[PDB]
Write an enzyme that holds these catalytic residues in place. Structure first.
Site, PDB file in Angstrom:
ATOM      1  N   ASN A 180       0.886  -1.035   0.068  1.00 16.26           N
ATOM      2  CA  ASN A 180      -0.087  -0.184  -0.045  1.00 16.26           C
ATOM      3  C   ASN A 180       0.900   1.358  -0.178  1.00 16.26           C
ATOM      4  OD1 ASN A 180      -2.384   1.273   0.135  1.00 16.26           O
ATOM      5  ND2 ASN A 180      -2.545   1.491   2.319  1.00 16.26           N
TER       6      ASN A 180
ATOM      7  N   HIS B 278      10.223   3.012   4.793  1.00 13.68           N
ATOM      8  CA  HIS B 278       9.284   1.938   4.412  1.00 13.68           C
ATOM      9  C   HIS B 278       9.570   1.553   3.006  1.00 13.68           C
ATOM     10  CE1 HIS B 278       6.086  -0.914   4.617  1.00 13.68           C
ATOM     11  NE2 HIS B 278       5.534  -0.160   3.465  1.00 13.68           N
TER      12      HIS B 278
ATOM     13  N   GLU C 128      10.675  -4.763   5.017  1.00 15.91           N
ATOM     14  CA  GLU C 128       9.782  -3.768   5.476  1.00 15.91           C
ATOM     15  C   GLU C 128       8.279  -4.630   5.285  1.00 15.91           C
ATOM     16  OE1 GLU C 128       9.019  -0.585   7.017  1.00 15.91           O
ATOM     17  OE2 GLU C 128      11.150  -0.986   7.743  1.00 15.91           O
TER      18      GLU C 128
ATOM     19  N   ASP D 222       5.497  -5.144   2.347  1.00 18.16           N
ATOM     20  CA  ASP D 222       4.291  -4.496   3.180  1.00 18.16           C
ATOM     21  C   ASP D 222       3.138  -5.531   2.909  1.00 18.16           C
ATOM     22  OD1 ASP D 222       3.009  -2.087   4.534  1.00 18.16           O
ATOM     23  OD2 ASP D 222       1.775  -2.319   2.622  1.00 18.16           O
ATOM     24  N   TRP D 223       1.772  -4.984   2.513  1.00 18.09           N
ATOM     25  CA  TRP D 223       0.848  -6.109   2.355  1.00 18.09           C
ATOM     26  C   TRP D 223       1.103  -7.202   1.259  1.00 18.09           C
ATOM     27  CZ3 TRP D 223      -2.638  -7.089   5.490  1.00 18.09           C
ATOM     28  CH2 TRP D 223      -2.773  -6.141   6.421  1.00 18.09           C
TER      29      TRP D 223
HETATM   30 CL   LIG Z   1      -1.421   0.078   5.163  1.00 13.27          CL
END
Ligand SMILES: [Cl-]
Length: 293
Positions: A38, A269, A127, A103-104
């Site tokens: 995201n 990130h 990350e 992330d996702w």
């Molecule tokens: Cl998020």
């Protein structure tokens, strides 16, 4: 750092909807599947893929509702993304893969790996999402922001009505300044505010402080798997980092089996935007020894 996206579009029809993906490199080997999070897309991998493509197929989908993929009017829960990505992978006939995840994309990749462990030859991660058991374990600088994101009133105002995840959180979590050409690539899927639903649901799904319980349990399960799996792992980290600060990367080097860590230097990130060449070159160098069964 390159701003262009010199990749031809590919599409596959999954669950009534088209997903866009990058697909480059040879087809007779084990592909490398790149999974963004995201509020990004395959654009995030644009400067990493060129290092890997010489030797390996690179497949980089845009998650449903993101990038150049179609925009069904979903709630865009994690479970929606799981359904679409599972179907994507089968539609392409992938058997064994190497994962490159963020992330996702890391929640999706680790969840898929746990369920399909015989099909994962290696995991390169950065990350990534693990449980954040209390708010104090979330980075201070981002705490009131994410607490506000995780509301039905203010969070929707900020993320959907004001585009705060694109205009705010994304550049704030890159050390170097993003250029306006780069920002326009990230803005393009979300020019119309209503299409920003996935950008709001995702932070609301993060496993923080026990909530939401289903995601916390899912993520605990894949992390238990990961901590006991012999699969080769490559973990990139930056300073100060966001989800994986330096001291936690060092702990993971020790607690994850067959794990190589790589210090990318400054990073928050979106590490791929601060040091794509070291990420890509280190992934490329790591792939060959994964081949043998
Ligand atoms: Cl998020």
């Amino acid at each position: 750092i390159g701003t262009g996206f010199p990749f031809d579009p590919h599409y596959v029809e999954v669950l009534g909807e088209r997903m866009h993906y990058v697909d480059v490199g040879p087809r007779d080997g084990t592909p490398v599947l790149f999974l963004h999070g995201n509020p990004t897309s395959s654009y995030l991998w644009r400067n990493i893929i060129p290092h890997v493509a010489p030797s390996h197929r690179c497949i980089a989908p845009d998650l449903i509702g993101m990038g150049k993929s179609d925009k069904p009017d979903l709630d865009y829960f994690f479970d929606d993304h799981v359904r679409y990505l599972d179907a994507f992978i089968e539609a392409l006939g992938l058997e064994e893969v190497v994962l490159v995840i963020h992330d996702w994309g890391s929640a999706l990749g680790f969840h898929w790996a746990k369920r399909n462990p015989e099909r994962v030859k290696g995991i390169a991660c950065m990350e990534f999402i693990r449980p954040i058991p209390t708010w104090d374990e979330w980075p201070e600088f981002a705490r009131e922001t994410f607490q506000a994101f995780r509301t039905a009133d203010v969070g929707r105002e900020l993320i959907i009505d004001q585009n705060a995840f694109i205009e705010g959180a994304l550049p704030k979590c890159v050390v170097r300044p993003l250029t306006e050409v780069e920002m326009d690539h990230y803005r393009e899927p979300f020019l119309k505010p209503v299409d920003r639903e996935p950008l709001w649901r995702f932070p609301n799904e993060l496993p923080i402080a026990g909530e939401p319980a289903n995601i916390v349990a899912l993520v605990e399960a894949y992390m238990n798997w990961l901590h006991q799996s012999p699969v080769p792992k490559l973990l990139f980290w930056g300073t100060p980092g966001v989800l994986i600060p330096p001291a936690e990367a060092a702990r993971l080097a020790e607690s994850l089996p067959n794990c190589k860590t790589v210090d990318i230097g400054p990073g928050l990130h979106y590490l791929q935007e601060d040091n794509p060449d070291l990420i890509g070159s280190e992934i490329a160098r790591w792939l060959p020894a994964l081949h043998h069964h």
